[PDB]
Design a protein around this ligand. Sequence first.
Ligand SMILES: [Mg+2]
Ligand SMILES: [Zn+2]
Ligand SMILES: [Zn+2]
Lengths: 194, 290, 105, 77, 1116, 91, 151
Amino acid sequence: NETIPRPIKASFREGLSVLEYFISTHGARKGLADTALRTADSGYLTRRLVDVSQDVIIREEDCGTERGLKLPIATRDADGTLRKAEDVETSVYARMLAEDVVIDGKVIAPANVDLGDVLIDALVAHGVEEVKTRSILTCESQVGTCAMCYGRSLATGKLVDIGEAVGIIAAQSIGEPGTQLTMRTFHTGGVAGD
Amino acid sequence: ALKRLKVVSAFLQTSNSPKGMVLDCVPVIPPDLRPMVQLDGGRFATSDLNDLYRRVINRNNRLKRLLDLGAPEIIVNNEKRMLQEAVDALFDNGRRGRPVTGPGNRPLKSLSDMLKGKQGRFRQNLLGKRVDYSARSVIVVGPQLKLHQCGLPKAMALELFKPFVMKRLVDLNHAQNIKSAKRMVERGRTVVYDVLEEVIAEHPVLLNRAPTLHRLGIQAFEPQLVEGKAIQIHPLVCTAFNADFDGDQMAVHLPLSAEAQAEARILMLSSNNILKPADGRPVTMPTQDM
Amino acid sequence: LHTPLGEDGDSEFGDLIEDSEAVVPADAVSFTLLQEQLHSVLDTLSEREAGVVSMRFGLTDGQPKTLDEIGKVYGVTRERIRQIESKTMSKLRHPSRSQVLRDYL
Amino acid sequence: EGIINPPIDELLEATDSKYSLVIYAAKRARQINAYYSQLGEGLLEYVGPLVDTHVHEKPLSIALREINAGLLTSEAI
Amino acid sequence: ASTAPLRISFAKIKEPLEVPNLLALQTESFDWLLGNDAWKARVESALESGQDVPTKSGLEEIFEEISPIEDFSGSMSLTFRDHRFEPPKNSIDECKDRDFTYAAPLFVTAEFTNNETGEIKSQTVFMGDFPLMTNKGTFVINGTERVVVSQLVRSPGVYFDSSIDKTSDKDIFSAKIIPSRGAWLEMEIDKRDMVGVRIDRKRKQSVTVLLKALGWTTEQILEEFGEYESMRATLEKDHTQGQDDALLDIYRKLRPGEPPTREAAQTLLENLYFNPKRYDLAKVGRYKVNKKLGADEPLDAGVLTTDDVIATIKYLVKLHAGETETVGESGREIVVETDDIDHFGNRRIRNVGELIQNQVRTGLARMERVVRERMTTQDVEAITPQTLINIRPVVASIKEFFGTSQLSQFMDQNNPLSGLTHKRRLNALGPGGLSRERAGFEVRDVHPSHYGRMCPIETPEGPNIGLIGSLASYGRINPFGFIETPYRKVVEGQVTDDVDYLTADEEDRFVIAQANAALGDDMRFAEARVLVRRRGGEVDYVPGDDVDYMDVSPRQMVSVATAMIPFLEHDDANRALMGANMMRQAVPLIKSESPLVGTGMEYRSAADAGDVVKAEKAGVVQEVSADYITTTNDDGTYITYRLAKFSRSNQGTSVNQKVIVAEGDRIIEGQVLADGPATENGEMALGKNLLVAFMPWEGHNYEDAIILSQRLVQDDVLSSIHIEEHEVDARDTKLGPEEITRDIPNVSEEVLADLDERGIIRIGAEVVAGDILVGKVTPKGETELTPEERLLRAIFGEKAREVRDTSLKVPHGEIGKVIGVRVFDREEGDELPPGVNQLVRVYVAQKRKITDGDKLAGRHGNKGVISKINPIEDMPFLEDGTPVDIILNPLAVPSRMNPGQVLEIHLGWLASRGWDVSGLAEEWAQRLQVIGADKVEPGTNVATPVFDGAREDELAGLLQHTIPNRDGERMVLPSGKARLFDGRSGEPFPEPISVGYMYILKLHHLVDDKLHARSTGPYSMITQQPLGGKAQFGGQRFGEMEVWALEAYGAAYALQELLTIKSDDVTGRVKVYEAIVKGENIPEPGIPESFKVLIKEMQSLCLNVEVLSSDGMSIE
Amino acid sequence: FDELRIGLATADDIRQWSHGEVKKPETINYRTLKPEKDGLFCEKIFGPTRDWECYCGKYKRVRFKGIICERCGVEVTRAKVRRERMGHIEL
Amino acid sequence: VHLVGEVQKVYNSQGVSIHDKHIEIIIRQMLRRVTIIESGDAELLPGELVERTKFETENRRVVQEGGHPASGRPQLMGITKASLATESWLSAASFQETTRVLTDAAINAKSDSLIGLKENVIIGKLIPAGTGLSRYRNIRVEPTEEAKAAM
RNA sequence: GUAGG
Ligand SMILES: [Mg+2]
Ligand SMILES: [Zn+2]
Ligand SMILES: [Zn+2]
């Protein structure tokens, strides 16, 4: 992790210089070594997740309670306007509303209905700042967890059938991009632990 | 004290007595599981457990010999120490100091050593097993195929479908009897290939790549004969496997039972997995050229 | 056996060599079809003829019976049973009940 | 003339699930395959194909054909 | 003059120094080891030239260091004065054919001398056949060609390290002395503000006890060390005093459990460190330590001295004190600093000679202990040098090194280049060195000392990234074991025609300039500003006359393989690595052609490799035939070179050899007479050159798949021979002998149709899967004929005979014509191993044509699997009707950042169609005219040195001035793109397309090898689960991740069958097979066996693993 | 299959599992290549190497399976029983 | 919230996006146990991991018995530790550790209930996930009477 | 060991 005072001054069209080429291989070999290690570590991590994530299978049609989770439906609302959350998709889409929402004295989104583009856009237009979505964390199921709390499956785009193994799909999704991450601090900066 | 309470209560609630700490009669592995299988060339193949058992029984014999006659305390005590060393090496070789290196090039295997780790029993021969009715080959790109079609080479197909092609050949009277059918398929006549072309359709095959990061590794497809010696594959699904075409061998399996092929047609079919399970977006629409 | 052969993944040399005690399903099912066809072909013959040949070759029980040994339960004399065994040899050796069994060897 | 020829959505709405559809179609496929493999006993419990069939056919395809027709019915014990 | 065929050169700078012999590394090292006439001749040549060189041969040295053995009485001695060799008994061809280790006799004159007898008895004795290495460089053992690869290991020396401990919040300094052979010792200063010793890291202790145990007194100790407070604190806190007290205390600590003994402890210390035999410091180690510690001429060979220990202590304390320059103990002033292990001033290479010498040394150590034991148990006057020595350890050790040793590797023979490369590798993996699990980030990465000592570009891509690397182009080996690099001398700003060889530490002091830097017409620099490199890998420039050394050739950092790739400068290193790794796998073809565009060094790479056959004399050829070529020098010596023809290589490719020279043509020494595989006119040719165009095409080149015309299938342009050889053995078993015969039992007639009289396949008879090659029958076996089979025999009247068929058959999925058959027999004069009575080898050969599935790749790393071969018409053909022979997906070349190939393709089109440049007055035209590459006829090859290649301006000008191929029109546009007419539709393509000629290589990852299938096959004995591998019909393993995916799908039943029915359940396999053949439905699965085996294993360990049901016991 | 109870195996349990015991380090004869007596690979405790074939030549047939011949005491059965049967060593 | 935010921002650093339910399942898993404190009335040890369900059952039992409950504090441990301390010995053995888990199971004399997946892939029975569930598999199949009326 | 993934 040491930057050079004299950077490369030529394009691969123009053709590097011999010294420049030597300096380039420095980083490239290091990157290759890092990838070989990152793949190994990612495989290990995936095994740990999938083993710890087992035994979580959907074994009930509908939850027993009503307690939900508070999520920010819209954020960074500039002055005189309402702006939806930047990364709303990963968070609140495909989630089950624990209870109905009334903003003008009329129900807008009915309960136990998944949320897509149209419904979220409507709620944002109405101007509600937050939302209460059902989720596994507050789920109260005598056996495992219920289908409603986990909400619709992303892959099938439909409500999760009973008996689906959610743990293994969770582990696989978490583990797959580990090889793709390949992120590291560019330079220690000459300081350790900062 | 808290740690001790745990163990004593565990002993007390269990009906078994603690005296099992001191085993007296050492079991022995059944002979087959530790085979002294004959090897061509006058040589022999032996599992190290045979050597460990030889060591322990030999030392027990010598201790019996000493105890029979009047012997000093030093020698009998050393002998009992030796017996304890042999037994411990049998259960665990290398749990204390240098292991019993046996031939000297490497340590000797032990029972516990067999049940542990990457090469152990559990993680290599109970959660992953080799399987009959499978194959492997390089995979090449064939555009004209449909989303449900993959091109199996001829030889791989015929080897894969030997019971079925044989059954149809005898049923169609192309072969006289079963032995004649086997000889016929081994010979490889055009009639065999035609029967095969008849039997493969409407029978799923699971294509599958090696890393299998996420559930889009295993994908069912309809078979379809094609010349050459390489699997063909539908270019849209390639990015689900993360499979490039520099060169990449992809395994093929068969759902043998009726229930298995029902699962292949309904669940693992290649036309019902457009969306990557991670975040709910299209994944089966690659982008390199089209 | 527990020696490294080639790479660590290849591991023990034990894996490389096949066994012999394994029942090859191909040969076993070949034998089963041979058994079924042979029993059917015997049933093609007369009841007594098939029975005497089966006892002469132990098709019901692992030990074949000698000619005189067949002439106790059936009540036939050793030469009578010898004669009809020869006639069964004649009856089976026709081209009729031979095409199916030729391919089984 | 292919796996996808019976579309899945009708079967799904018929059986109200994905896995129940699999086990149910597989049970029907097993039943019909047992029927064709009778070779002479003629057991009354066994039932022939309700839909027309080809000279050579995979049983589970006929099972799925029956389900898509919707004529065959299921009921849990 | 006529060394190589003419090839146009685009080089811009002249190269004074010629590349050395590419294979010097192995041949010269083994030459030193043997100490034959060649080594001594080279030694005297160096001496008269003034060059330093070890004057003592290896073998005689290892004999000499073994002192004559002395008993407890010291009465007797054995002197091993002179060693010698004899010519090998077996010819190299004979050794290869008959499976004999190519060795020679090695004798030595042992002289017995006993003072009690007062007599000297000389006798010559023979230690054993010594594995020799042939001139081509490979150890022939057991008929196979193996090679020992050089090993990178840290040199013996004193190594200093600095680090930071977060808990301490302060710097920590340590030192370690790495001996060549002895036990290791370390010296850590201020771990907790105090200094301490690590005598093999046995127990905690101080330094004061050590010094006190030595003869050095506290008074002189503090006098020398009164200037640094840390040592004073250590001394004062040390309560113990006196040499005896410290000595007994350290002895107790090292070996507790017994009362201390003064003399025993003293002898222990002498043995550990002062004993010459026990502590061994190589000459290199001694050489290194003195420079590091600055001691002026210590003992040239000898163990460490207390002087050395105190000097290291002084260096360590000076370093921790913050002082950076200090007087060396009994030496000149020196910088005191920490040193990085990565720098090759500390790294060293163990060439083949030193490795073999080390194993011979171990063997002679075994011999010494054995003979000492014998003398301790032998009577006087009955002792002879012939009788007392046992030669078993030496022969066994050298044998144990060439078989079953990582550094002794199978010689790849895919092509000459893979040859040379596997010769020159520096395998850091190995015994007494860095291991795979031991690897870290630091060792793998490149270091600024790599220039000239290792090609940083190329290495295996697998987990052993960078650990293995090829030698640099000009690298030569320091006699100690470092790698030197040649540098041109620079004085007062003029480059001089003198070369000096500099090592990994000498190079640091000076400043090294750049080769590509321009020079004036005179020897002075054209520009005051010149880029230079300096200590620590710094790249700062220094204008004006300041440098003293500069690189001789631009390609100093690139090994041979990486030096092949033209236009490397324009390539990302990642893809250059891919290409270099993929340049060692090209298979030769029927007809080889040198590349049209490529580096000008390929000729040397082909020449030095032994595949080519060159003449040793300068005469007139007398007879030219395929089998043999006869030459006659003017002196009168006649020599007939026998050309190997269609003999299997290591990887199974033909080693066919052509002939080039005519009948009466004059020859010169070293001139090439016959090309080897993948060779043409003495030049490397690893593939062919195809006309090629960049454009997508109906997805048949999607994701970098390739499309190639059927014309390559038509003209055998890409066709490779493949020779497979496998054998069978007749062995006398317990029951009886096995027989080879045409009378195979229980078979048809036509199967044994083409066989020989004795039951062997004739020559020329094509074979298929199931064909009988050699008929073999078991002697007998106990046959209890079954009731059903009994009846069947009775009906058909056939006799089942105890002899059983065990004949050889073609393994499944094969094809070929038999080309040769060899038989060895016991009773005949030929020797065989025990038991085996006759051995038969059969050669089956085919001509694999380029087909779908064959891998294929360009030099720059564009590799793909052929996905379709259209007829010659569907090719998008060009204006004059020339079809394109291969299509490529352009989407690669931006993302892969490897635009070298576009330069290559344009230059290839340029090379195919000659150019004329005369009187153009253009800068590029002037550059070609001065270079001389102005007038070029079509098809004549060209050279683009790796870093002095063609500039884009030159390409543009030449393209604008290409000779008209036809109709007086230039067919490619100045842009480098031409008009393509679609073959299928016929409409001209909307815009022009790029087209040219690029070299392409047929790799050895062929489909035919990889293809595999299994209905049902053999099974493993310990656990019934099917075995693996292709040679034994193994089914593909179902991995744990695989079952996780299946669990995710929820498809339980498919998992259940894939786990139980299709393997791991003996009772279910036969049942399912009968069910499928009978058409009956599949039965319910049974319990797997492996759980049963596991249960027995847990039960064997006193764990009562009991399967129990909810209602009492369970049923299984 | 309902539960895999595991726990301490007492000496009585090991004796109960054992169908006999082992007394020698003998494995096979160098010449007959056959199992020795009362040692490792001892057919008298584990089982016949060949299917329904005893050691002493007395019985080699499948018909009269399920019996012990007093000559070598081998219980004629399928060879697979060797994969299951186990003995013990007394210290 | 902190865990989901941290992991999500790390992933979004590259750009890959993962739905938050997947994380929520794992974070639920890591939080499952509770460290018991003041285990006077409950009669088991103080200061050890206990399953949340087990803790609730014990507290309900003791309060029903009239004695005051023993206290508990939610405690977080890495996935490895929670995985090892699982009621299923077979699954834990199938994990990285064998000798210790085999030993402590043996001394404990704990019978493995086969509820779960990995242990049921060991025995080779049908996994209770997807097609293998009891409700799905117990169905019986027969056509309608009008079917036989037609043919 | 060494190549490909
Ligand atoms: Mg790949
Ligand atoms: Zn819920
Ligand atoms: Zn017997």
